[PDB]
C-alpha cells in the first residue's frame, strides 16, 4: 500500500491502493565535496482522457548541497516535460524540458533542456509507447542523494571487460530482499524466500592474479586473505538510478586499483549490471539480503568449465538501503 | 517434463516465469517443437546457410512448486534462449532440428560489464559442429537478453538448460547483414536520421499477465518498436537545403519492404528496392538487405516474441533530425508506410512425426 509500488505501471490523473488517489512523494538518502544527486520518477502519459502508458525514470544530474533540500525536492515537481520515442543502436526516450525553476539551471539536464536516454532503462515498458503521438512526462517522485563527487567513482567499462588466462573474476553474489505485496504480478518474477522475496545480482568487481609474482599457484586457500585486506562494504544508493555502492577499507593490489576510486569507493548503477531488478528498484522498497564474494575464471571460456569459489572467510558490511517515500508537508 | 495449458500453444510457455499461475485442467505435458522459415525467395544470393535458435528452460537441481513444474530438485526458473549460430544448408532439416534437443547443456550465471549467462556444452552431435557455439563448447551471452528473468536466477548452484523448442532459418549469409553499430551511431546536424515505427500484432492470451505490457486495440494486442534504419542529408550539392516533397520522392525511390525472423533471435527484415545514396549504403547490403536483431533495439519486445506468434501490423518511416538535441525541439516527420512481407513473419511451432 506504498505509492511508490505504483512506479511497477503498467505492470500493476492517478490511482491506488488505498488512498486511491496518490500525492506527490520525496525521500533524502545522506551519504555524506558534497552534491546532491536528483532522480525523478513518474509517468508517460498519452495526452487525450489521459492514458497512462508507463512509469518511468528521468535523472536530472547533481546541484551543490546548499539550502533546504525539501524545497529542492518541491521544485523537482514544477518542472513540464513531454516526450517522444528515438533510435540510435538502440530505442531511446527523449525527454525535453519545456519549463523548470532557477535551482536546477545548473544540472545538466535542465541546463540543456533535454535528455535522451535508453529506453529499456528509463522506461517500464517501453513497447507500450507509441512511436508517435503526443506524449507527456509527470513527476510524482523525487529522489536526493547527498555523496561526495569522488564517492561515486563509475569503473571505465573497458576495465570490466578485461580478461585473461592468467587472472580470477572477482564477483559478487548480491541478494535483495524485497517489499511485495503477495498478489502482486511481481512475485513471479522474484526466487522465494521462508521470510518473503529476493532478487538475484551476480556483480563483477575485482580482478585477480592467479600466481604471486613469477611463480606458483596462488595458494586457493589464500585468495582469501587477500579479500578479507581488502575489506568490502556494500550498500545500496539511489545516485540517477538504483545503484550498488562497494567501498574498500583496505588496500588495493595492482589488479584491483582501477576497479576502486583512489578513496576505495565504486559505484555500480544497476541498470547497467541487471536492467530488471533496477526497475523492480523503482517501486520496491529493498535491501541487501546477502553479499558474498566469488571468485571466477579470468575468462568466459573457462568459467563456463571451472568451478566457482565462495569465499567463506569475509562477512561483508551491508550498510546503506533503497529508502522509503514520504509526502510533503 | 514441464506441463501447460493444452488450450495454448505450448511456445506460450517460454514467457515463464511470466505466465499465469492456473494452467487450467487438464494440463498436459510440453513435448519438443520446431519451425523452419525459407528464405530463399527474399532475394537472388543462393540459400547456403541455416541459422539456428534455441528455446528452453533453466532448470535448479537441489521447495517451490506449481502445476507447471512439479518435481524435486528440479525446479524450473527461467525460459531463455541459446543461439547456436548457423550450419551449411545440406540434407533434412527436420532432423538437423532434431539434432537440437539432444545437446547437454549447463550453464551459470557470471558477468563483466553487465549480468552474463554462461551456456556450456557438454555433448553434441557431429551435425551440429559447424556452428560457432558447438566448436567453442560455450557462449557468454547478455544475461537480460537471453533470459526471461535473470533476477530470478541464483548467483551458485547447480543449472541445467533445456531445449524444447527449435526455430531454423534458411538464408544466404550474404543476405542477413547486422549493420556494425559504429554506423548505428553516426549522427550529425546537416543529417536526418531515417526511422521505422514498428507496429507489431501478437497473438495472446487475454488473461495472461503479458497482455499488460502491450498497446490495446480493436483487432488485438499490439508492441512499439522504433528502429532507427539510415541517414540522409539535410542539404544538396552546392546549394543547400531538401525539400520536404524531394526527402518523399527519395523514400519512395528506395522503396522498403519489411518483415520479422528468427535470426538468432527475433529480428526485423528490411529490404530496399532503390539505389542507396552516399550516406544510406551502409545501412545496406550489397544487395538491399539488413537484419536488425530485435533483442538489441528493444529487449523486452524480443522476448515477448520468443513466446507468441506475431506479425506486423505496420511500419511507417519517419524522418527525425541527425541529433538527439535537436530531435528533442523539432517534430518528426511520418512520411510513408513501408510495403509488409506476408511471409515473413513470428511463425507458429509444431510437435515432430511420430
Redesign the interface.
Known amino acids: 500500500l506504498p505509492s511508490s509500488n505504483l512506479l511497477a505501471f503498467?505492470?500493476?490523473q492517478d490511482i491506488g491502493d488505498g488512498k486511491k488517489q496518490i500525492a506527490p512523494q520525496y525521500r533524502i538518502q545522506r551519504l555524506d565535496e558534497d552534491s546532491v544527486f536528483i532522480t525523478t520518477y513518474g509517468f508517460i502519459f498519452q495526452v487525450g482522457k489521459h492514458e497512462l502508458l508507463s512509469a518511468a525514470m528521468l535523472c536530472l544530474g547533481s546541484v551543490p548541497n546548499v539550502g533546504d533540500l525539501v524545497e529542492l525536492a518541491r521544485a523537482c515537481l514544477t518542472m513540464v516535460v513531454t516526450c517522444?520515442?528515438?533510435?540510435?543502436?538502440?530505442?531511446?526516450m527523449?525527454?525535453?524540458v519545456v519549463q523548470a525553476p532557477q535551482v536546477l539551471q545548473s544540472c545538466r539536464v535542465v541546463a540543456?533542456?533535454?535528455s535522451?536516454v535508453n529506453?529499456?532503462k528509463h522506461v517500464k515498458?517501453?513497447?507500450?509507447?507509441?512511436?508517435?503521438g503526443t506524449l507527456e512526462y509527470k513527476v510524482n517522485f523525487v529522489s536526493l542523494t547527498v555523496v561526495p563527487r569522488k564517492d561515486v567513482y563509475k569503473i571505465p567499462?573497458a576495465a570490466?571487460?578485461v580478461?585473461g588466462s592468467s587472472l580470477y573474476?572477482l564477483?559478487l553474489?548480491?541478494?535483495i530482499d524485497v517489499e511485495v505485496d503477495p498478489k502482486s504480478?511481481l512475485v513471479?518474477?522474484?526466487?522465494?524466500s521462508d521470510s518473503g522475496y529476493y532478487?538475484?545480482?551476480?556483480?563483477?568487481i575485482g580482478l585477480m592474479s592467479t600466481v604471486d609474482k613469477k611463480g606458483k599457484k596462488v595458494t586457493f586457500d589464500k585468495l582469501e586473505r587477500k579479500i578479507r585486506r581488502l575489506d568490502l562494504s556494500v550498500g545500496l544508493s539511489d545516485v540517477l538510478g538504483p545503484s550498488v555502492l562497494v567501498k574498500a577499507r583496505g588496500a588495493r593490489t595492482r589488479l584491483l586499483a582501477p576497479f576502486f576510486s583512489s578513496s576505495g569507493t565504486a559505484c555500480y548503477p544497476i541498470s547497467?549490471?541487471?536492467?530488471?531488478?533496477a526497475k523492480?528498484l523503482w517501486s520496491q522498497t529493498a535491501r541487501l539480503r546477502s553479499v558474498?564474494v566469488?571468485i571466477?575464471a579470468g575468462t568466459?571460456?573457462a568459467?563456463?568449465?571451472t568451478a566457482?569459489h565462495?569465499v567463506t572467510s569475509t562477512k561483508i558490511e551491508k550498510r546503506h538501503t533503497i529508502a522509503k517515500y514520504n509526502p510533503f508537508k
Open positions: 503498467p505492470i500493476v517522444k520515442k528515438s533510435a540510435t543502436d538502440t530505442e531511446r527523449v525527454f525535453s540543456n533542456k533535454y535522451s529506453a529499456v515498458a517501453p513497447e507500450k509507447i507509441p512511436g508517435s567499462t570490466l571487460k580478461s573474476n564477483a553474489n548480491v541478494t504480478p513471479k518474477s522474484l526466487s522465494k532478487a538475484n545480482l551476480f556483480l563483477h547497467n549490471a541487471s536492467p530488471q531488478v523492480i558474498k566469488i571466477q568466459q571460456r568459467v563456463a568449465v566457482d565462495e
